[PDB]
Amino acid sequence: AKRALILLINHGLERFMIGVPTLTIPKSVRQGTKQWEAAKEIVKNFVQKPRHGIILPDDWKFDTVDLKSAMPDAIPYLTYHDAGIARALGIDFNTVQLNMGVQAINIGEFVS
Amino acid sequence: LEGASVPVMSTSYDVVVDREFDELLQGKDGLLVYHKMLSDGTVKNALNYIFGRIRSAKWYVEPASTDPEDIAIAAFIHAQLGIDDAS
Numbered sequence: 001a002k003r004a005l006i007l008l009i010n011h012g013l014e015r016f017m018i019g020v021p022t023l024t025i026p027k028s029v030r031q032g033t034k035q036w037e038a039a040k041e042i043v044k045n046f047v048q049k050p051r052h053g054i055i056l057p058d059d060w061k062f063d064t065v066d067l068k069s070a071m072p073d074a075i076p077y078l079t080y081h082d083a084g085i086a087r088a089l090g091i092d093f094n095t096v097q098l099n100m101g102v103q104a105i106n107i108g109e110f111v112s
Numbered sequence: 113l114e115g116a117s118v119p120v121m122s123t124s125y126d127v128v129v130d131r132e133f134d135e136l137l138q139g140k141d142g143l144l145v146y147h148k149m150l151s152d153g154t155v156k157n158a159l160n161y162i163f164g165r166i167r168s169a170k171w172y173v174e175p176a177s178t179d180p181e182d183i184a185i186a187a188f189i190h191a192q193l194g195i196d197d198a199s
Contacts, residue, residue: 084153085153087153087154087157088153088156088157089160090156090157090160090161090164092157092161
Protein backbone atom coordinates (compact mmCIF):
# COMPACT_ATOMS: atom_id res chain seq x y z
CA ALA A 1 0.00 0.00 0.00
CA LYS A 2 2.88 2.41 0.92
CA ARG A 3 4.65 1.72 -2.44
CA ALA A 4 1.39 2.21 -4.46
CA LEU A 5 0.59 5.50 -2.58
CA ILE A 6 4.09 7.02 -3.18
CA LEU A 7 3.58 6.39 -6.98
CA LEU A 8 0.07 8.04 -6.87
CA ILE A 9 1.33 11.10 -4.83
CA ASN A 10 4.36 11.64 -7.18
CA HIS A 11 1.97 11.72 -10.23
CA GLY A 12 -0.65 13.99 -8.55
CA LEU A 13 2.04 16.47 -7.37
CA GLU A 14 3.18 17.11 -11.02
CA ARG A 15 -0.35 17.94 -12.37
CA PHE A 16 -1.15 20.27 -9.36
CA MET A 17 2.42 21.81 -9.33
CA ILE A 18 2.88 22.44 -13.15
CA GLY A 19 -0.65 22.21 -14.66
CA VAL A 20 -1.84 20.40 -17.85
CA PRO A 21 -1.63 22.86 -20.82
CA THR A 22 -4.52 23.04 -23.40
CA LEU A 23 -4.38 25.06 -26.69
CA THR A 24 -7.61 25.49 -28.76
CA ILE A 25 -6.98 26.48 -32.44
CA PRO A 26 -9.06 27.14 -35.61
CA LYS A 27 -10.32 24.09 -37.62
CA SER A 28 -8.28 25.42 -40.62
CA VAL A 29 -4.96 24.50 -38.80
CA ARG A 30 -3.77 21.11 -40.23
CA GLN A 31 -1.04 18.77 -38.84
CA GLY A 32 2.38 19.01 -40.62
CA THR A 33 2.05 22.84 -41.11
CA LYS A 34 4.00 25.90 -39.75
CA GLN A 35 0.94 26.73 -37.54
CA TRP A 36 0.88 23.12 -36.19
CA GLU A 37 4.61 23.28 -35.10
CA ALA A 38 3.86 26.64 -33.36
CA ALA A 39 0.97 24.95 -31.40
CA LYS A 40 3.28 22.03 -30.25
CA GLU A 41 6.05 24.57 -29.28
CA ILE A 42 3.62 26.62 -27.08
CA VAL A 43 2.46 23.50 -25.10
CA LYS A 44 6.06 22.14 -24.75
CA ASN A 45 7.49 25.54 -23.62
CA PHE A 46 4.69 26.04 -20.99
CA VAL A 47 6.04 22.87 -19.25
CA GLN A 48 9.81 23.26 -19.95
CA LYS A 49 10.41 27.09 -20.21
CA PRO A 50 7.76 29.01 -18.17
CA ARG A 51 9.80 32.31 -18.36
CA HIS A 52 9.36 32.06 -22.22
CA GLY A 53 5.82 33.53 -22.43
CA ILE A 54 3.01 32.88 -24.97
CA ILE A 55 2.01 35.14 -27.94
CA LEU A 56 -1.44 34.18 -29.42
CA PRO A 57 -3.59 35.39 -32.35
CA ASP A 58 -7.14 36.28 -31.14
CA ASP A 59 -8.62 32.96 -32.52
CA TRP A 60 -6.18 30.78 -30.42
CA LYS A 61 -7.03 30.15 -26.69
CA PHE A 62 -4.50 28.86 -24.06
CA ASP A 63 -5.59 27.42 -20.67
CA THR A 64 -4.58 24.83 -18.01
CA VAL A 65 -7.11 22.04 -17.14
CA ASP A 66 -9.32 23.24 -14.21
CA LEU A 67 -9.09 20.40 -11.62
CA LYS A 68 -11.83 22.30 -9.59
CA SER A 69 -10.35 21.69 -6.06
CA ALA A 70 -7.08 21.73 -4.05
CA MET A 71 -4.86 18.58 -4.20
CA PRO A 72 -6.04 16.09 -1.52
CA ASP A 73 -3.57 15.77 1.46
CA ALA A 74 -2.59 12.04 1.24
CA ILE A 75 0.31 12.36 3.83
CA PRO A 76 -1.82 11.10 6.80
CA TYR A 77 -2.98 7.95 4.82
CA LEU A 78 0.62 7.28 3.57
CA THR A 79 2.02 7.51 7.18
CA TYR A 80 -0.89 5.26 8.43
CA HIS A 81 0.36 2.47 6.04
CA ASP A 82 4.14 3.22 6.48
CA ALA A 83 4.02 3.30 10.35
CA GLY A 84 1.71 0.20 10.05
CA ILE A 85 4.74 -1.87 8.80
CA ALA A 86 6.39 -1.47 12.30
CA ARG A 87 3.01 -1.99 14.15
CA ALA A 88 2.69 -5.45 12.38
CA LEU A 89 6.09 -6.50 13.97
CA GLY A 90 4.72 -5.66 17.49
CA ILE A 91 6.50 -2.27 17.95
CA ASP A 92 4.21 -0.04 20.13
CA PHE A 93 5.71 3.43 19.32
CA ASN A 94 5.38 5.28 15.93
CA THR A 95 8.73 4.63 13.99
CA VAL A 96 7.94 7.18 11.17
CA GLN A 97 6.84 10.31 13.19
CA LEU A 98 9.33 9.35 16.02
CA ASN A 99 9.69 12.45 18.36
CA MET A 100 7.73 14.91 16.07
CA GLY A 101 4.15 16.24 16.70
CA VAL A 102 1.77 16.45 19.73
CA GLN A 103 2.07 13.09 21.64
CA ALA A 104 1.59 11.22 24.94
CA ILE A 105 3.69 12.65 27.89
CA ASN A 106 5.01 9.15 28.84
CA ILE A 107 6.95 7.72 25.77
CA GLY A 108 8.68 5.33 28.27
CA GLU A 109 5.45 3.26 28.78
CA PHE A 110 5.17 2.57 24.96
CA VAL A 111 8.87 1.38 24.92
CA SER A 112 7.94 -0.94 27.93
CA LEU B 113 -23.71 -40.90 48.58
CA GLU B 114 -24.82 -40.20 44.94
CA GLY B 115 -22.91 -38.96 41.83
CA ALA B 116 -24.18 -36.29 39.34
CA SER B 117 -27.95 -36.46 38.43
CA VAL B 118 -27.50 -33.71 35.70
CA PRO B 119 -25.51 -34.42 32.49
CA VAL B 120 -23.36 -31.80 30.64
CA MET B 121 -25.63 -30.36 27.84
CA SER B 122 -24.82 -28.41 24.61
CA THR B 123 -25.23 -24.55 24.51
CA SER B 124 -27.96 -24.84 21.79
CA TYR B 125 -31.38 -23.11 21.28
CA ASP B 126 -33.22 -22.12 18.02
CA VAL B 127 -30.53 -20.88 15.50
CA VAL B 128 -27.73 -21.07 18.18
CA VAL B 129 -25.87 -24.41 17.71
CA ASP B 130 -23.05 -25.17 20.21
CA ARG B 131 -22.68 -21.39 21.03
CA GLU B 132 -22.67 -20.21 17.33
CA PHE B 133 -25.54 -18.56 15.33
CA ASP B 134 -23.52 -17.38 12.22
CA GLU B 135 -23.17 -20.23 9.62
CA LEU B 136 -19.95 -18.62 8.14
CA LEU B 137 -18.13 -19.16 11.54
CA GLN B 138 -19.53 -22.68 12.40
CA GLY B 139 -17.04 -25.61 12.50
CA LYS B 140 -13.77 -25.75 10.51
CA ASP B 141 -14.91 -23.09 7.97
CA GLY B 142 -14.83 -20.79 11.05
CA LEU B 143 -11.15 -21.79 11.70
CA LEU B 144 -10.18 -20.58 8.13
CA VAL B 145 -11.56 -17.05 8.99
CA TYR B 146 -9.48 -16.86 12.25
CA HIS B 147 -6.38 -18.17 10.35
CA LYS B 148 -6.76 -15.42 7.66
CA MET B 149 -7.06 -12.72 10.45
CA LEU B 150 -3.46 -13.64 11.62
CA SER B 151 -2.26 -11.87 8.34
CA ASP B 152 -3.73 -8.54 9.66
CA GLY B 153 -1.07 -6.20 11.20
CA THR B 154 -3.45 -4.96 14.00
CA VAL B 155 -4.34 -8.61 15.01
CA LYS B 156 -0.60 -9.62 15.02
CA ASN B 157 0.37 -6.44 17.03
CA ALA B 158 -2.29 -7.37 19.70
CA LEU B 159 -1.27 -11.11 19.94
CA ASN B 160 2.47 -10.13 20.22
CA TYR B 161 1.59 -7.92 23.29
CA ILE B 162 -0.93 -10.34 24.96
CA PHE B 163 1.21 -13.55 24.46
CA GLY B 164 4.41 -11.67 25.57
CA ARG B 165 2.74 -10.38 28.80
CA ILE B 166 1.27 -13.89 29.61
CA ARG B 167 4.77 -15.56 29.39
CA SER B 168 6.39 -12.71 31.49
CA ALA B 169 4.03 -13.28 34.56
CA LYS B 170 6.88 -14.61 36.88
CA TRP B 171 5.53 -18.23 36.88
CA TYR B 172 6.25 -20.38 40.00
CA VAL B 173 4.90 -23.51 41.82
CA GLU B 174 2.86 -23.21 45.10
CA PRO B 175 2.77 -26.40 47.26
CA ALA B 176 -0.57 -28.01 48.38
CA SER B 177 0.58 -27.19 52.01
CA THR B 178 3.64 -26.12 54.12
CA ASP B 179 4.14 -29.89 54.96
CA PRO B 180 7.70 -31.00 54.00
CA GLU B 181 6.28 -33.80 51.71
CA ASP B 182 4.02 -31.30 49.80
CA ILE B 183 7.14 -29.02 49.46
CA ALA B 184 9.18 -32.04 48.15
CA ILE B 185 6.52 -32.87 45.47
CA ALA B 186 6.29 -29.14 44.48
CA ALA B 187 10.15 -29.08 44.06
CA PHE B 188 9.98 -32.13 41.68
CA ILE B 189 7.49 -30.17 39.44
CA HIS B 190 9.60 -26.93 39.72
CA ALA B 191 12.59 -29.01 38.41
CA GLN B 192 10.51 -30.68 35.60
CA LEU B 193 9.47 -27.21 34.16
CA GLY B 194 12.84 -25.45 34.83
CA ILE B 195 11.11 -22.50 36.63
CA ASP B 196 13.50 -19.44 36.48
CA ASP B 197 13.47 -15.57 36.77
CA ALA B 198 12.87 -14.98 32.97
CA SER B 199 10.35 -17.92 32.55
